Structures are given as C-alpha cells and as structure tokens.
Amino acid sequence: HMATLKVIGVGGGGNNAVNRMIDHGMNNVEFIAINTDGQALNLSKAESKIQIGEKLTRGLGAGANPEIGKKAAEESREQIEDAIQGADMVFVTSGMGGGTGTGAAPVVAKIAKEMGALTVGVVTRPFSFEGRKRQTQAAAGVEAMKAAVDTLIVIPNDRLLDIVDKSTPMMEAFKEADNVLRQGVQGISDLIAVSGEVNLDFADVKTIMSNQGSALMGIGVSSGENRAVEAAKKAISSPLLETSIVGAQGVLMNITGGESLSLFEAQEAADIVQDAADEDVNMIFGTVINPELQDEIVVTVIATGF
Ligand SMILES: Nc1nc2c(ncn2[C@@H]2O[C@H](COP(=O)(O)OP(=O)(O)O)[C@@H](O)[C@H]2O)c(=O)[nH]1
Ligand SMILES: NC(=O)c1c(F)ccc(OCc2nc3cc(C(F)(F)F)cnc3s2)c1F
Ligand SMILES: [Ca+2]
CATH class of the missing domain: 3.40.50.1440 (Tubulin/FtsZ, GTPase domain)
Structure with a gap:
C-alpha cells in the first residue's frame, strides 16, 4: 500500500x-x-x-x-x-x-x-x-x-x-x-516511505485520526544530554495550536534516532507524552533507527480524542 x-x-x-x-x-x-x-x-x-x-x-x-x-x-x-x-x-x-x-x-x-x-x-x-x-x-x-x-x-x-x-x-x-x-x-510521507523498527503505517494513522475532532500535531528535535525528554516536550508544546495535549485519548508517537537510541530514553519520551494525556489513552508507539544519524533524535506526536 x-x-x-x-x-x-x-x-x-x-x-x-x-x-x-x-x-x-x-x-x-x-x-x-x-x-x-x-x-x-x-x-x-x-x-x-x-x-x-x-x-x-x-x-x-x-x-x-x-x-x-x-x-x-x-x-x-x-x-x-x-x-x-x-x-x-x-x-x-x-x-x-x-x-x-x-x-x-x-x-x-x-x-x-x-x-x-x-x-x-x-x-x-x-x-x-x-x-x-x-x-x-x-x-x-x-x-x-x-x-x-x-x-x-x-x-x-x-x-x-x-x-x-x-x-x-x-x-x-x-x-x-x-x-x-x-x-x-x-x-505522513515519511511514515509511508520508511520501515520502522517498530513500524507504523497508514492504518495506524487512520485509527488515531478517523472520526475524531480536534487534534494536536507536533515535532521536536534535539541532541546531546536529555535529548529524549527535550524532543518530547517540544513535540507536545504546540504554541501555535488551539488544542493542547491535556486529556488526549489517542496518540500516535514516533521516535526516530540513530543506532544510539536507547530503551531508557524511549521510555522517558513516552512517559512525558503519557503523563500529559488521558488515563485511557490508546497510544500507538513507533520507532525508526536511521544509521545515518549520529546524536539527533526526532519525536513526532499526533494527539486526538478530547
Ligand atoms: N497565517 C495566515 N493567515 C492568513 C493568510 N491569508 C489570509 N489569512 C487569514 O485567512 C483569513 C481569510 O482570508 P482569505 O483566505 O484571504 O479569504 P477567502 O479567500 O475569502 O477565503 C484572513 O481573515 C486571515 O486571518 C496567510 O497567508 N497566512
Ligand atoms: N515508525 C514508523 O514506521 C515511522 C516511520 F518509519 C517514519 C515516520 C514516522 O512518523 C511520522 C508521522 N507523521 C504524522 C503526521 C500526521 C498528521 F497529523 F496527519 F499530519 C499523522 N501521523 C503521523 S505519523 C513513523 F512513525
Ligand atoms: Ca512506516
């Protein structure tokens, strides 16, 4: 597809x-x-x-x-x-x-x-x-x-x-x-083109976005110490959007990093997003390992269901 x-x-x-x-x-x-x-x-x-x-x-x-x-x-x-x-x-x-x-x-x-x-x-x-x-x-x-x-x-x-x-x-x-x-x-273009280590596809996008209402979407990019927390915080900040992360019932979250991407830092990032959103969030989590990256990571968050 x-x-x-x-x-x-x-x-x-x-x-x-x-x-x-x-x-x-x-x-x-x-x-x-x-x-x-x-x-x-x-x-x-x-x-x-x-x-x-x-x-x-x-x-x-x-x-x-x-x-x-x-x-x-x-x-x-x-x-x-x-x-x-x-x-x-x-x-x-x-x-x-x-x-x-x-x-x-x-x-x-x-x-x-x-x-x-x-x-x-x-x-x-x-x-x-x-x-x-x-x-x-x-x-x-x-x-x-x-x-x-x-x-x-x-x-x-x-x-x-x-x-x-x-x-x-x-x-x-x-x-x-x-x-x-x-x-x-x-x-979306990236999601369709790239194979994730924990792969997300267009059906995941549809689950999170079909027949909802308001949405937040955001990306955060960081490197060095505390990169995962910093990127996740940036992704959800959404200063130009009317909708905030608070109370989101559905989240699509992806982390793209190099081969250094750690399990610990994936958890840290996911926890930032979870702590901000609903108790009953349906989170679809993805990861991309791109070996051409060095110390940069990119966290993407789509949040719906308010
Ligand atoms: N951020 C942004 N807002 C715009 C731009 N152009 C128009 N607007 C906003 O869009 C509203 C509708 O303007 P416009 O799209 O030109 O009217 P329409 O062609 O009759 O739909 C305006 O009242 C502005 O608030 C733009 O390029 N950027
Ligand atoms: N894990 C993945 O398969 C993967 C990937 F390979 C590449 C990129 C990825 O994430 C990017 C996304 N961007 C948007 C934008 C939107 C939106 F809101 F429509 F603009 C919705 N979902 C996504 S998922 C991934 F989740
Ligand atoms: Ca994909």
Whole structure:
C-alpha cells in the first residue's frame, strides 16, 4: 500500500500555504488549489486548479461572504469530486473568517470524507485586529469544518504574535504557521516511505485520526544530554495550536534516532507524552533507527480524542 496524499488549499490563505509548500519542495503529494478568485488562482503554483463559482462571482472572490463560498463550491461540486479522485488522505487547508475558505472548505472536506479519504483540516482563525465579524464568521467556519472532517487542527493567528519580535516580517511569521501543515504532510510521507523498527503505517494513522475532532500535531528535535525528554516536550508544546495535549485519548508517537537510541530514553519520551494525556489513552508507539544519524533524535506526536 502506498497512500495517495492530496493537499487542498481553499481560498486565499489556504492557497498561500499551498504555494509556499510547493516552493519548499514536496514530492509524492498532489496539490490542489481551489478559489473563487480567478486572478489569484491563475498565479497559483499547483498543477490542479479549480475555479469555483464562476457563475455566481463572475471570477471574483467571495467578498468575505461565506454564503458565496459555500454556494460556489456547490456550483462546482463535480469538478471538486474529479480533483479528489483516488485520494487516501486529504489535507484541507484554509483561513477561516473570509468568504471562500469559510464557506467552501467544509464542502470540500465533506466531498473528500465521502470518497473515503482520511480528511484532515488545517485552518487558521483570524487575528483579533481583524475584528468581531471576522472572528464570528471564522467560528462558524470552524464548527462547519469540525462536522465535515475526520480531524481538525486550528491555528489561531493571534498565536503568531507570541513568536515574533517587533521587527519580524509578516511573511516570516506566516511561514511559521505554514510549517504546521508542512510538517504534518512530510510526517505522513515519511511514515509511508520508511520501515520502522517498530513500524507504523497508514492504518495506524487512520485509527488515531478517523472520526475524531480536534487534534494536536507536533515535532521536536534535539541532541546531546536529555535529548529524549527535550524532543518530547517540544513535540507536545504546540504554541501555535488551539488544542493542547491535556486529556488526549489517542496518540500516535514516533521516535526516530540513530543506532544510539536507547530503551531508557524511549521510555522517558513516552512517559512525558503519557503523563500529559488521558488515563485511557490508546497510544500507538513507533520507532525508526536511521544509521545515518549520529546524536539527533526526532519525536513526532499526533494527539486526538478530547
Ligand atoms: N497565517 C495566515 N493567515 C492568513 C493568510 N491569508 C489570509 N489569512 C487569514 O485567512 C483569513 C481569510 O482570508 P482569505 O483566505 O484571504 O479569504 P477567502 O479567500 O475569502 O477565503 C484572513 O481573515 C486571515 O486571518 C496567510 O497567508 N497566512
Ligand atoms: N515508525 C514508523 O514506521 C515511522 C516511520 F518509519 C517514519 C515516520 C514516522 O512518523 C511520522 C508521522 N507523521 C504524522 C503526521 C500526521 C498528521 F497529523 F496527519 F499530519 C499523522 N501521523 C503521523 S505519523 C513513523 F512513525
Ligand atoms: Ca512506516
């Protein structure tokens, strides 16, 4: 089995994330760009582009109206279905609070889910500086997304204000939010491609992520003394995510290390994650030994079921 992965941007912010991922370089992933705005869509780097709602919008965006995004996606339902064909896992990425993403992303997600793809949403909430109506529209979008997806990751854009100094470029801050999605997608690609010593596969991902609600996903990288604890703590920290590790009922955890990876340090790392999560956690633990590594380890945590 070699899972077919698709990443679907919906609306401006979603397609921004897709464009920046295509620039970064991602092999064996199909990118799909969905927008009402034909001008923006023409500039996308994606090899699959779906202009939605042209009869409704005349090729403009949705003008921040979620109803127009929803109706646009419904107008173009067949074209969305065609683009998703074959997917085993779909990431739907979108900025909540505008028109196209808020309205169309839940329609796209439901199409993917009903095609049998594991459907993961990765969405932003607006900055508080964008105001109340934007935040209220976004909240309705988040709720609609939750209904439509298997698992949802929410990045409040206000969390970016916690990781910048007064001079950090806005584009550099956006790249931090992009990395949540990128690391998730790359993590799945790695799981599918690499044989673990304690091997995890796509069925494990489905067990942890299918028909859940909110999710945390995170990676931590460290070396030297206390590397296992440090990497595990970093993985669960998730400063940009709305969802925390506390109370998680399902966890997929992997440790990748060199030949030096010790049993003791695997336990230390796993204990950090366990102590943070529910009493009845269903933890699926994996390990990869990569002999090309020296002293670095990478801990990956996906947590669901709250
Ligand atoms: N982090 C991040 N947030 C974005 C970006 N673009 C837009 N946003 C957010 O996404 C929300 C919706 O904007 P947009 O996606 O352009 O609207 P739509 O095209 O009508 O779906 C905005 O209110 C912002 O909070 C981006 O590139 N990065
Ligand atoms: N132990 C393994 O088989 C193994 C591997 F070989 C390579 C990489 C591994 O872990 C990476 C993962 N990344 C994600 C990302 C996601 C998510 F949330 F969809 F982005 C879900 N599950 C995983 S598992 C492994 F668990
Ligand atoms: Ca594997």
